[PDB]
């Protein structure tokens, strides 16, 4: 399920053809507003623990916006994931 | 600067656009004459009426400051109604934030003028305080409690007069802060114009073009105000307020200030307490609905014949309601007022939106 | 909103004269009156009728009121 | 003279921070004002209704109000008339105006007593000392007729003759009416008259202290929680070299 | 704390203690001729006899 | 008093007509005028309240 | 709606090390709101006619529900206002905050406006102190040559303090606080251009933290302490900082023999009282406050704050002790030896600010070799 | 003034713990008192003297005043 | 108020002195009568409206300072009222 969740938020980089039309809200906002050069969610596993999160690369003036949208997306999945975005993931 | 001097403005706004600055001037005028009157006014019921006569008879130029304040309130409403009419006709209401703040401004000015009229404690002062605060009694379960709480007692009395002086004193400054917010939202878009078409291709600087035009407008406002103050200071007032308040007797031909007559006619047309109060509230609050009722593909009524005809019918109807509000509750005024009241809501809620759709059809879009 | 950032305009020329080189009231009456008359006529059919109606309702209602207050209306 | 004698501190039972007034003492104090002081001193800001639930029941206060006649009117003939007092009436004034009071008191003016305790440095300590401190003029001091020596009054020459002494009145509860007892009770009553909110502010003050004893360390804990991120942070400088 | 504070302020606007001090009124009936409505000021309002 | 269509009372503020019983008969008022507590005493007197 | 509420609060950059001395700015904002809230509610029951002013105040305290708490909260709140004002100014002098010239000078205007405002409010209950305070203070203007007396009578609305005076003072006292509020917002706007100074006097751009949640919670803690101090006064000693003579209605025929100003005006009153000349005392009074506008021009130290300046610190506390001396003297009769102590304290006040401190600054610079 | 545009900083590392992982009152008394004592000692010689002077002037002046109001046998 | 309007200061002074007004209290705490002066307001014919109504078969003569501004028609109304008394028309019978 975490992998599905991470697929919903996805990854992104300035060379993606999708742009404003990308399904992931984070990727879409990032592209239209030029919030980052790139980002990727990740789920690094170890025996009984791991790191579940994301990494992003951006201009010095976009860090706060990136963080805001990224966390807003985690929060939206916790309380409001939709069947259709989940099927997509 | 850039909030005035180099503010971009449409090259074609007409005199109907002068009322915003005139409202600013009416507000400043009321604040200035108001403070000076407050330097000699006392709010105790035993001395309120007396202090006002003292202002008019013994304070140097007290009479001119007083009548300028009284007639200034009338000019304020003339300008407010012209300002709102301009907005409806030209579709300025599509600037939603600016418009809704404007509605709040109208209600606050109404509440402000109501309380000021109570201050001299004449007959109209007293019964106006009684009636208007009692509108709240229509609120179920707690209405009566709210009224007594506002009054500070079981009837309008000292406690009422004293707090009303305080409310009337501070509210205009709140209005000033709300008006500054009104302008800030406006500045985000700049002004609309008679054509309803974007004027970005032909903007001119506010200074000197509109600064001089506003000054000319200010001069005309002052002429109108002073014609009233120096030649007919009581023309727009009510003789009954020259009689001290008498809690045991309501004058037989009591009537509201002229600028409240249309709303009073609407409330009086409904033989039900809650219904009349709801119609009164709605006659003002419906302004907040205008934007949602806009069906035309065009912003202004300049190019819309049918809409214009219905607009003037609405103005003529408000004129009818104003006249009816000044007449006794007798035949055939009772029926004319009921028709006029129904026509008011019918023009706004149904006929105008419908004319908008028909006009669209006729233009093939 | 600031001059320099309003919108895009191309190929428009504007010619103007200094206010010191021209009259402030050119053909004030000779051309002003005709224009006022034109504007007045163009709107009258849209503005006046509702007010005429008001007048009729006003005179009718007032008369009806008086008549009703006497012995033999 | 310009010499001053300041009053000592009596241990009033309402002296403490959380100490309320003694209401039985307020009640006897009212009897003193009524029986003794009211013939010369007004108390314009206290009405009979103010006594209800303080030192008298509603019926007792009504009965007290009816013991006096107050002016009312105009009636339907345009004339003023007298009627028994009621709860809403203020305590009767002994004189119509200060001029009349002075005339009735060799030119001196008995001040209104509603706020006397708050209007004098030393408050009830001062008033108690004044009432119980009259004594003979010291050697070399001779006062004009009309004046009495009182070491606690400024200048030591007062226009008020000693107003209380043993048995000056009889208390409803049989308390021995010694001069000092009468002084102590009227002073307690005067404190209540000048500060009817006295007991309520202290009860509120207790609640305020308890709430602060709770809220201050809790908000402080919230402050340290948030700030811990910064207070324990560690820095390191790693320049290239 | 907010509840108490706010309610004390709101309360200051309600009828003050002097306003609540009410009583009854006696009216001489022989002064009111048949057919007449007499008005008296009572408990803040008009009282018709 | 003595105005309105019922020889009772007429409220000039918004046209409420009452009868000589103080009952609302026409207009926007919702209720009959309030009847206070009172008692007829000695003489020709009435104590209200 | 978001922005300017946000970037003007939430993400406002603030020094990581400002101390409790930086809490007084928000405490002043709270004192202002308190005064405005209790003020409006009192104004709902107060009447400004001389025949009924004093009475309306007793009516508030005796019969209006909770009228007494609102009244004593307003009276004691004015005292808290000054305590905070003086702590705020002291912080500024000690840490060199005055180098923010616009913010500082607006602050000087704020101090004067609050003083004028508090003065007029004190006149409203029309007790003895109200009346003589109105008389004396308005008369300060009579020191103005040629028109002084005319200005006074114009302010009074007559040849003496009377009805016209009380009524206009209610109006002035009513509106001034709102003007103070607008001036304070300007105070803050200029401050935001630079951000805050800190105890070290060294730029804190390399170590800023967001105002929220660090200072929002710290300010709330400070607000609680302010409320505790206020309520200790209101609930346990409401008259402690007041004057018994104002419980006596105004008497135009008699000035109380031991009349003395409100405690927060005592230092200035002591200074004026020390000069046996009318105009001289008025000028010294005016200058005792206006000299604050000169502090920036008198700064000689190469360092902004007094934190690293021992000599300047000693002189700073001597100034505070001196103001404490003047406050004490202002409460004593004009007799020996108080007349001389007060004159020395008055001279010492201007000497510390105009001469000793600038000199300590230069000496410290020399000791550090720059 | 906005984060992102304050000033230039290079080669500085900052380590921090979540407030939920740490104590809000670590060594409150064990280390707090020693620090209060130190701070108090460091400032006392700069803060206290002027106030001691005030105390001396205050007691001297008050006494001198009382003395002057009495027993002047002439 | 009459000075410089319809009477000289001395004439008005003489007019005021034609009446006695109450003043006081004096040093004995009593009220007393004295000749009127320029600062006195015109004497009231009754101490209160009740006495006025009593003296006028129950009707209340209103105060006249603002009567012209307090009545539609102003002086046209007042002049018409004063000069317009006439017999009741046939069929109209007024109470005493
Ligand atoms: C009761 C309510 C009281 C409220 C207070 C008063 C509010 C006044 C509103 C502001 C109106 C004044 C204003 O600034 O508008 C200028 C307004 C615009 O007229 P304009 O400057 O001649 O502009 C020429 C037209 O755009 C070009 O049109 P034109 O060629 O047809 O000429 C029109 C002009 C000249 O035509 C003739 O009459 C000739 O007629 C006039 O307006 C005069 O002039 C006036 O209405 C006031 C002139 C008074 C002197
Ligand atoms: C009443 C007068 C009228 C004025 C109105 C009242 C307003 C009060 C001014 C605002 C200050 C409030 C405030 O923000 O308090 C922060 C401040 C919080 O200090 P903190 O969180 O412990 O800071 C640690 C120090 O930076 C590091 O210091 P440390 O580790 O050496 O320990 C010191 C600390 C703990 O040491 C011990 O006492 C143990 O002692 C306290 O500060 C308590 O509390 C005070 O300074 C108390 C205010 C005194 C009043
Ligand atoms: C609220 C109660 C108030 C009671 C109502 C009072 C009645 C007063 C009515 C008199 C109004 C004066 C009308 C004179 C103007 C007539 C005129 O010139 O109309 C034609 C003209 C043609 O202009 P364009 O289509 O832009 O084309 C320009 C081509 N050169 O139309 C206009 O000027 C339209 C401007 C209308 C704005 C003012 C409307 C009048 C105000 C009344 C109140 C309005 C209603 C809102 C109240 C809701 C509560
Ligand atoms: C003294 C107290 C005032 C008395 C009040 C009584 C009311 C009398 C009303 C005044 C009459 C209206 C005159 C106003 C002034 C006219 C004006 O400014 O319009 C200028 C106008 C511009 O024409 P253009 O062809 O478009 O441009 C110039 C190209 N060569 O010219 C005219 O129409 C009139 C030409 C004659 C000049 C008039 C005098 C100008 C004014 C100067 C102020 C004079 C002194 C004041 C004393 C007044 C007596
Ligand atoms: C105006 C009239 C008012 C009358 C005056 C009332 C007298 C009240 C005096 C008591 C003031 C409380 C003093 C307690 C604080 C003592 C203290 O801690 O001092 C040492 C300490 C060391 O700090 P740093 O150098 O930053 O180094 C930090 C190392 N960890 O110094 C400080 O805290 C400095 C802060 C000073 C601000 C407060 C000044 C007191 C205010 C009084 C009025 C000021 C004058 C301006 C009035 C002009 C009109
Ligand atoms: C109902 C009538 C109530 C009457 C009111 C009386 C007023 C008396 C005032 C008492 C004030 C009590 C406030 C205590 C605050 C203690 C606090 O928060 O300090 C935290 C302190 C320090 O820990 P750290 O080293 O920072 O790290 C976390 C540990 N791993 O933790 C402790 O070990 C203390 C344990 C105490 C737990 C307190 C929990 C807070 C919640 C409830 C408060 C309830 C109080 C009301 C009691 C009603 C009877
Ligand atoms: C009239 C016969 C009096 C009686 C009975 C009492 N008092 Fe009196 N008192 C009287 C006068 C004329 C004066 C004025 C004295 C002067 O020289 O000014 C006073 C004054 C007081 C005062 C005020 C003292 C002050 O500091 O100014 C107090 C506190 C006082 N009186 C109290 C008081 C009380 C409580 C009494 C009943 C026990 C009482 N007085 C009786 C006249 C008369
Ligand atoms: C104290 C009252 C008010 C003041 C001081 C005020 C002032 C102004 C000012 C200065 C302008 C610009 C000039 C103009 O176009 O007129 C303006 C525009 C406008 N106002 Fe108001 N206003 C007030 C009340 C209102 C009300 C009651 C409404 C309508 C319910 C309103 C709606 C608008 C709108 C929509 C605009 C944009 C006009 C356009 O560009 O066409 N205003 N106002
Ligand atoms: C939106 C602005 C204002 C409006 C619309 C307004 C309106 C009014 C009205 C209608 C009256 C009744 C006038 C009369 O017939 O006597 C009045 C009275 C009065 N107003 Fe205002 N007012 C405004 C602002 C102010 C301000 C700011 C003050 C004072 C600080 C003030 C002070 C007074 C006083 C003291 C009176 C009583 C004396 C009098 O009746 O003239 N007003 N006001
Ligand atoms: C109604 C009065 C006042 C209000 C509401 C007020 C408010 C504030 C606020 C909220 C701040 C930021 C927080 C702080 O550092 O405390 C501030 C800073 C400041 N204020 Fe005021 N102030 C007032 C009076 C004054 C006075 C009388 C002065 C000085 C003559 C002054 C000088 C300053 C200065 C220079 C700062 C910068 C402090 C620093 O960063 O070191 N203020 N004030
Ligand atoms: C900078 C804010 C303010 C200050 C410093 C201030 C100060 C004062 C002072 C010192 C008094 C005398 C208190 C006493 O009775 O001992 C007073 C009284 C008064 N103030 Fe204010 N005031 C402020 C704001 C306001 C405002 C905004 C209003 C009303 C809108 C107001 C209304 C009153 C009233 C009605 C009184 C008379 C009642 C009383 O004495 O408590 N004040 N004020
Ligand atoms: C916080 C403690 C400060 C000292 C409180 C003394 O306060 C003073 O008490 C005098 C009466 O003794 C009053 O006349 C004076 O106005 C008042 O400021």
PDB file of N, CA, C and O in Angstrom, chain B residues 6 8 187-189 200-201 203-205 308 312-313 315-316 319-320 323 330-333 336, chain C residues 1-3 6-9 45-47 50-51 54 57-62 64-65 68-69:
ATOM      1  N   UNK B   6       0.247  57.850  -9.986  1.00  0.00           N
ATOM      2  CA  UNK B   6       0.384  57.135 -11.254  1.00  0.00           C
ATOM      3  C   UNK B   6      -0.563  55.958 -11.383  1.00  0.00           C
ATOM      4  O   UNK B   6      -0.339  55.045 -12.176  1.00  0.00           O
ATOM      5  N   UNK B   8      -3.200  53.764 -12.725  1.00  0.00           N
ATOM      6  CA  UNK B   8      -3.785  53.732 -14.070  1.00  0.00           C
ATOM      7  C   UNK B   8      -5.318  53.783 -13.972  1.00  0.00           C
ATOM      8  O   UNK B   8      -5.910  53.094 -13.144  1.00  0.00           O
ATOM      9  N   UNK B 187      -8.131  48.256  -6.332  1.00  0.00           N
ATOM     10  CA  UNK B 187      -6.840  48.482  -6.971  1.00  0.00           C
ATOM     11  C   UNK B 187      -6.225  47.250  -7.605  1.00  0.00           C
ATOM     12  O   UNK B 187      -5.371  47.361  -8.480  1.00  0.00           O
ATOM     13  N   UNK B 188      -6.652  46.073  -7.169  1.00  0.00           N
ATOM     14  CA  UNK B 188      -6.113  44.858  -7.748  1.00  0.00           C
ATOM     15  C   UNK B 188      -6.582  44.761  -9.198  1.00  0.00           C
ATOM     16  O   UNK B 188      -5.864  44.237 -10.054  1.00  0.00           O
ATOM     17  N   UNK B 189      -7.772  45.287  -9.481  1.00  0.00           N
ATOM     18  CA  UNK B 189      -8.313  45.229 -10.843  1.00  0.00           C
ATOM     19  C   UNK B 189      -8.348  46.560 -11.573  1.00  0.00           C
ATOM     20  O   UNK B 189      -8.338  46.594 -12.802  1.00  0.00           O
ATOM     21  N   UNK B 200      -7.577  48.247 -20.554  1.00  0.00           N
ATOM     22  CA  UNK B 200      -6.126  48.167 -20.449  1.00  0.00           C
ATOM     23  C   UNK B 200      -5.388  48.768 -21.647  1.00  0.00           C
ATOM     24  O   UNK B 200      -4.238  49.198 -21.512  1.00  0.00           O
ATOM     25  N   UNK B 201      -6.033  48.816 -22.809  1.00  0.00           N
ATOM     26  CA  UNK B 201      -5.392  49.387 -23.995  1.00  0.00           C
ATOM     27  C   UNK B 201      -5.465  50.913 -24.027  1.00  0.00           C
ATOM     28  O   UNK B 201      -4.879  51.544 -24.906  1.00  0.00           O
ATOM     29  N   UNK B 203      -5.376  53.322 -20.831  1.00  0.00           N
ATOM     30  CA  UNK B 203      -5.365  53.826 -19.464  1.00  0.00           C
ATOM     31  C   UNK B 203      -4.684  55.180 -19.458  1.00  0.00           C
ATOM     32  O   UNK B 203      -3.823  55.446 -20.296  1.00  0.00           O
ATOM     33  N   UNK B 204      -5.099  56.057 -18.545  1.00  0.00           N
ATOM     34  CA  UNK B 204      -4.481  57.381 -18.409  1.00  0.00           C
ATOM     35  C   UNK B 204      -4.142  57.502 -16.930  1.00  0.00           C
ATOM     36  O   UNK B 204      -4.709  56.787 -16.114  1.00  0.00           O
ATOM     37  N   UNK B 205      -3.189  58.373 -16.560  1.00  0.00           N
ATOM     38  CA  UNK B 205      -2.877  58.469 -15.130  1.00  0.00           C
ATOM     39  C   UNK B 205      -3.949  59.206 -14.333  1.00  0.00           C
ATOM     40  O   UNK B 205      -4.481  60.216 -14.785  1.00  0.00           O
ATOM     41  N   UNK B 308     -31.683  47.889 -19.740  1.00  0.00           N
ATOM     42  CA  UNK B 308     -31.755  49.277 -19.345  1.00  0.00           C
ATOM     43  C   UNK B 308     -33.176  49.633 -18.957  1.00  0.00           C
ATOM     44  O   UNK B 308     -33.400  50.293 -17.947  1.00  0.00           O
ATOM     45  N   UNK B 312     -34.282  51.085 -15.187  1.00  0.00           N
ATOM     46  CA  UNK B 312     -34.993  52.300 -14.848  1.00  0.00           C
ATOM     47  C   UNK B 312     -36.335  51.985 -14.199  1.00  0.00           C
ATOM     48  O   UNK B 312     -36.838  52.784 -13.414  1.00  0.00           O
ATOM     49  N   UNK B 313     -36.904  50.815 -14.487  1.00  0.00           N
ATOM     50  CA  UNK B 313     -38.164  50.430 -13.861  1.00  0.00           C
ATOM     51  C   UNK B 313     -37.883  50.204 -12.374  1.00  0.00           C
ATOM     52  O   UNK B 313     -38.690  50.556 -11.518  1.00  0.00           O
ATOM     53  N   UNK B 315     -35.500  51.687 -10.608  1.00  0.00           N
ATOM     54  CA  UNK B 315     -35.285  52.996 -10.004  1.00  0.00           C
ATOM     55  C   UNK B 315     -36.635  53.686  -9.792  1.00  0.00           C
ATOM     56  O   UNK B 315     -36.881  54.271  -8.732  1.00  0.00           O
ATOM     57  N   UNK B 316     -37.513  53.604 -10.787  1.00  0.00           N
ATOM     58  CA  UNK B 316     -38.833  54.207 -10.689  1.00  0.00           C
ATOM     59  C   UNK B 316     -39.602  53.505  -9.576  1.00  0.00           C
ATOM     60  O   UNK B 316     -40.381  54.138  -8.866  1.00  0.00           O
ATOM     61  N   UNK B 319     -38.554  54.706  -6.292  1.00  0.00           N
ATOM     62  CA  UNK B 319     -39.098  56.045  -6.132  1.00  0.00           C
ATOM     63  C   UNK B 319     -40.537  55.884  -5.655  1.00  0.00           C
ATOM     64  O   UNK B 319     -41.011  56.655  -4.820  1.00  0.00           O
ATOM     65  N   UNK B 320     -41.224  54.869  -6.177  1.00  0.00           N
ATOM     66  CA  UNK B 320     -42.607  54.597  -5.792  1.00  0.00           C
ATOM     67  C   UNK B 320     -42.653  54.190  -4.331  1.00  0.00           C
ATOM     68  O   UNK B 320     -43.474  54.691  -3.554  1.00  0.00           O
ATOM     69  N   UNK B 323     -42.137  57.095  -2.017  1.00  0.00           N
ATOM     70  CA  UNK B 323     -43.350  57.893  -1.906  1.00  0.00           C
ATOM     71  C   UNK B 323     -44.330  57.171  -0.991  1.00  0.00           C
ATOM     72  O   UNK B 323     -44.852  57.773  -0.063  1.00  0.00           O
ATOM     73  N   UNK B 330     -53.218  53.467   4.329  1.00  0.00           N
ATOM     74  CA  UNK B 330     -54.607  53.514   3.895  1.00  0.00           C
ATOM     75  C   UNK B 330     -54.724  53.216   2.405  1.00  0.00           C
ATOM     76  O   UNK B 330     -53.725  53.208   1.682  1.00  0.00           O
ATOM     77  N   UNK B 331     -55.945  52.955   1.948  1.00  0.00           N
ATOM     78  CA  UNK B 331     -56.224  52.651   0.534  1.00  0.00           C
ATOM     79  C   UNK B 331     -56.033  53.969  -0.240  1.00  0.00           C
ATOM     80  O   UNK B 331     -56.412  55.030   0.228  1.00  0.00           O
ATOM     81  N   UNK B 332     -55.497  53.884  -1.511  1.00  0.00           N
ATOM     82  CA  UNK B 332     -54.984  52.670  -2.203  1.00  0.00           C
ATOM     83  C   UNK B 332     -53.481  52.437  -2.044  1.00  0.00           C
ATOM     84  O   UNK B 332     -52.883  51.602  -2.729  1.00  0.00           O
ATOM     85  N   UNK B 333     -52.883  53.188  -1.125  1.00  0.00           N
ATOM     86  CA  UNK B 333     -51.453  53.108  -0.858  1.00  0.00           C
ATOM     87  C   UNK B 333     -51.001  51.733  -0.369  1.00  0.00           C
ATOM     88  O   UNK B 333     -49.892  51.299  -0.679  1.00  0.00           O
ATOM     89  N   UNK B 336     -50.740  49.680  -3.566  1.00  0.00           N
ATOM     90  CA  UNK B 336     -49.677  50.159  -4.443  1.00  0.00           C
ATOM     91  C   UNK B 336     -48.329  49.740  -3.856  1.00  0.00           C
ATOM     92  O   UNK B 336     -47.437  49.291  -4.582  1.00  0.00           O
TER      93      UNK B 336
ATOM     94  N   UNK C   1      -1.363  47.172 -10.440  1.00  0.00           N
ATOM     95  CA  UNK C   1      -1.411  47.446 -11.869  1.00  0.00           C
ATOM     96  C   UNK C   1      -0.595  48.698 -12.159  1.00  0.00           C
ATOM     97  O   UNK C   1      -0.921  49.795 -11.703  1.00  0.00           O
ATOM     98  N   UNK C   2       0.456  48.525 -12.951  1.00  0.00           N
ATOM     99  CA  UNK C   2       1.367  49.612 -13.265  1.00  0.00           C
ATOM    100  C   UNK C   2       1.624  49.803 -14.758  1.00  0.00           C
ATOM    101  O   UNK C   2       1.678  48.836 -15.511  1.00  0.00           O
ATOM    102  N   UNK C   3       1.766  51.060 -15.183  1.00  0.00           N
ATOM    103  CA  UNK C   3       2.038  51.343 -16.587  1.00  0.00           C
ATOM    104  C   UNK C   3       3.330  50.608 -16.904  1.00  0.00           C
ATOM    105  O   UNK C   3       4.293  50.674 -16.142  1.00  0.00           O
ATOM    106  N   UNK C   6       0.521  46.660 -18.292  1.00  0.00           N
ATOM    107  CA  UNK C   6      -0.925  46.509 -18.461  1.00  0.00           C
ATOM    108  C   UNK C   6      -1.320  45.497 -19.530  1.00  0.00           C
ATOM    109  O   UNK C   6      -2.010  44.518 -19.242  1.00  0.00           O
ATOM    110  N   UNK C   7      -0.899  45.728 -20.770  1.00  0.00           N
ATOM    111  CA  UNK C   7      -1.229  44.799 -21.841  1.00  0.00           C
ATOM    112  C   UNK C   7      -0.367  45.024 -23.069  1.00  0.00           C
ATOM    113  O   UNK C   7       0.483  45.911 -23.085  1.00  0.00           O
ATOM    114  N   UNK C   8      -0.600  44.226 -24.101  1.00  0.00           N
ATOM    115  CA  UNK C   8       0.181  44.314 -25.326  1.00  0.00           C
ATOM    116  C   UNK C   8      -0.524  45.104 -26.426  1.00  0.00           C
ATOM    117  O   UNK C   8      -1.667  44.805 -26.770  1.00  0.00           O
ATOM    118  N   UNK C   9       0.159  46.113 -26.970  1.00  0.00           N
ATOM    119  CA  UNK C   9      -0.385  46.940 -28.048  1.00  0.00           C
ATOM    120  C   UNK C   9       0.662  47.146 -29.142  1.00  0.00           C
ATOM    121  O   UNK C   9       1.821  47.462 -28.863  1.00  0.00           O
ATOM    122  N   UNK C  45     -36.207  56.979 -24.625  1.00  0.00           N
ATOM    123  CA  UNK C  45     -37.137  55.855 -24.661  1.00  0.00           C
ATOM    124  C   UNK C  45     -36.826  54.799 -23.619  1.00  0.00           C
ATOM    125  O   UNK C  45     -37.699  54.018 -23.240  1.00  0.00           O
ATOM    126  N   UNK C  46     -35.580  54.760 -23.168  1.00  0.00           N
ATOM    127  CA  UNK C  46     -35.201  53.776 -22.167  1.00  0.00           C
ATOM    128  C   UNK C  46     -35.349  54.332 -20.753  1.00  0.00           C
ATOM    129  O   UNK C  46     -35.728  53.601 -19.840  1.00  0.00           O
ATOM    130  N   UNK C  47     -35.083  55.622 -20.569  1.00  0.00           N
ATOM    131  CA  UNK C  47     -35.157  56.231 -19.245  1.00  0.00           C
ATOM    132  C   UNK C  47     -36.530  56.733 -18.802  1.00  0.00           C
ATOM    133  O   UNK C  47     -37.003  56.380 -17.722  1.00  0.00           O
ATOM    134  N   UNK C  50     -40.622  54.510 -17.467  1.00  0.00           N
ATOM    135  CA  UNK C  50     -40.857  54.072 -16.085  1.00  0.00           C
ATOM    136  C   UNK C  50     -41.228  55.230 -15.161  1.00  0.00           C
ATOM    137  O   UNK C  50     -42.025  55.068 -14.237  1.00  0.00           O
ATOM    138  N   UNK C  51     -40.651  56.398 -15.420  1.00  0.00           N
ATOM    139  CA  UNK C  51     -40.916  57.566 -14.602  1.00  0.00           C
ATOM    140  C   UNK C  51     -42.265  58.165 -14.941  1.00  0.00           C
ATOM    141  O   UNK C  51     -42.896  58.796 -14.096  1.00  0.00           O
ATOM    142  N   UNK C  54     -44.562  56.062 -13.050  1.00  0.00           N
ATOM    143  CA  UNK C  54     -44.553  56.489 -11.662  1.00  0.00           C
ATOM    144  C   UNK C  54     -45.491  57.674 -11.515  1.00  0.00           C
ATOM    145  O   UNK C  54     -46.304  57.732 -10.597  1.00  0.00           O
ATOM    146  N   UNK C  57     -49.108  56.544 -11.718  1.00  0.00           N
ATOM    147  CA  UNK C  57     -49.493  55.846 -10.494  1.00  0.00           C
ATOM    148  C   UNK C  57     -49.564  56.847  -9.357  1.00  0.00           C
ATOM    149  O   UNK C  57     -50.456  56.773  -8.521  1.00  0.00           O
ATOM    150  N   UNK C  58     -48.622  57.788  -9.331  1.00  0.00           N
ATOM    151  CA  UNK C  58     -48.606  58.799  -8.289  1.00  0.00           C
ATOM    152  C   UNK C  58     -49.862  59.673  -8.312  1.00  0.00           C
ATOM    153  O   UNK C  58     -50.528  59.817  -7.291  1.00  0.00           O
ATOM    154  N   UNK C  59     -50.193  60.256  -9.466  1.00  0.00           N
ATOM    155  CA  UNK C  59     -51.382  61.102  -9.542  1.00  0.00           C
ATOM    156  C   UNK C  59     -52.658  60.298  -9.318  1.00  0.00           C
ATOM    157  O   UNK C  59     -53.563  60.768  -8.632  1.00  0.00           O
ATOM    158  N   UNK C  60     -52.728  59.084  -9.865  1.00  0.00           N
ATOM    159  CA  UNK C  60     -53.928  58.264  -9.686  1.00  0.00           C
ATOM    160  C   UNK C  60     -54.164  57.896  -8.227  1.00  0.00           C
ATOM    161  O   UNK C  60     -55.272  58.036  -7.713  1.00  0.00           O
ATOM    162  N   UNK C  61     -53.115  57.421  -7.565  1.00  0.00           N
ATOM    163  CA  UNK C  61     -53.239  57.027  -6.176  1.00  0.00           C
ATOM    164  C   UNK C  61     -53.571  58.179  -5.251  1.00  0.00           C
ATOM    165  O   UNK C  61     -54.360  58.017  -4.324  1.00  0.00           O
ATOM    166  N   UNK C  62     -52.955  59.334  -5.482  1.00  0.00           N
ATOM    167  CA  UNK C  62     -53.216  60.497  -4.653  1.00  0.00           C
ATOM    168  C   UNK C  62     -54.657  60.958  -4.810  1.00  0.00           C
ATOM    169  O   UNK C  62     -55.319  61.272  -3.825  1.00  0.00           O
ATOM    170  N   UNK C  64     -57.251  59.153  -5.872  1.00  0.00           N
ATOM    171  CA  UNK C  64     -58.091  58.102  -5.325  1.00  0.00           C
ATOM    172  C   UNK C  64     -58.154  58.220  -3.810  1.00  0.00           C
ATOM    173  O   UNK C  64     -59.190  57.956  -3.205  1.00  0.00           O
ATOM    174  N   UNK C  65     -57.042  58.617  -3.202  1.00  0.00           N
ATOM    175  CA  UNK C  65     -56.979  58.766  -1.756  1.00  0.00           C
ATOM    176  C   UNK C  65     -57.879  59.891  -1.260  1.00  0.00           C
ATOM    177  O   UNK C  65     -58.647  59.704  -0.321  1.00  0.00           O
ATOM    178  N   UNK C  68     -61.614  59.238  -1.651  1.00  0.00           N
ATOM    179  CA  UNK C  68     -62.081  58.306  -0.625  1.00  0.00           C
ATOM    180  C   UNK C  68     -62.277  58.938   0.746  1.00  0.00           C
ATOM    181  O   UNK C  68     -62.893  58.333   1.625  1.00  0.00           O
ATOM    182  N   UNK C  69     -61.766  60.146   0.944  1.00  0.00           N
ATOM    183  CA  UNK C  69     -61.931  60.783   2.238  1.00  0.00           C
ATOM    184  C   UNK C  69     -63.140  61.709   2.314  1.00  0.00           C
ATOM    185  O   UNK C  69     -63.358  62.352   3.336  1.00  0.00           O
TER     186      UNK C  69
END
